[PDB]
Amino acid sequence: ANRFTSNIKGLTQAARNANDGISVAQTTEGALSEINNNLQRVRELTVQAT
Amino acid sequence: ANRFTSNIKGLTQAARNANDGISVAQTTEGALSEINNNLQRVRELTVQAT
Numbered sequence: 001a002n003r004f005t006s007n008i009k010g011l012t013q014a015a016r017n018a019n020d021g022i023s024v025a026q027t028t029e030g031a032l033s034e035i036n037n038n039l040q041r042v043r044e045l046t047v048q049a050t
Numbered sequence: 051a052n053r054f055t056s057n058i059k060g061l062t063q064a065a066r067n068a069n070d071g072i073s074v075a076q077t078t079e080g081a082l083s084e085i086n087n088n089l090q091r092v093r094e095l096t097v098q099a100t
Contacts, residue, residue, distance in 0.1 A: 036052065043056055047063040 040052075040056055040059065044059045044063050047060045048067065
């Protein structure tokens with residue numbers, strides 16, 4: 001039972017740690033999406049300029 | 051989808067650029083027409099003068 005309790009607490013903490021990676025990836029992906037929009041507008045401008 | 055959006059924006063801007071060539075050709079054609087009329091009158095004058 002002591003080993004089982006240790007495992008249960010460890011796995012719960014592991015899931016909590018896992019959620020952090022999801023948060024980081026979401027924020028980073030939003031930033032990259034904004035960069036992508038800027039790049040798209042830059043490409044449109046180059047097409048207009050050439 | 052990102053590639054598709056880039057391509058659509060590029061093609062729309064390409065058509066927008068294309069219209070400018072039509073405008074240039076129209077203006078130049080008008081100028082050439084006026085030059086042609088003046089040349090025609092010059093030819094008539096030479097026929098009268100010879």
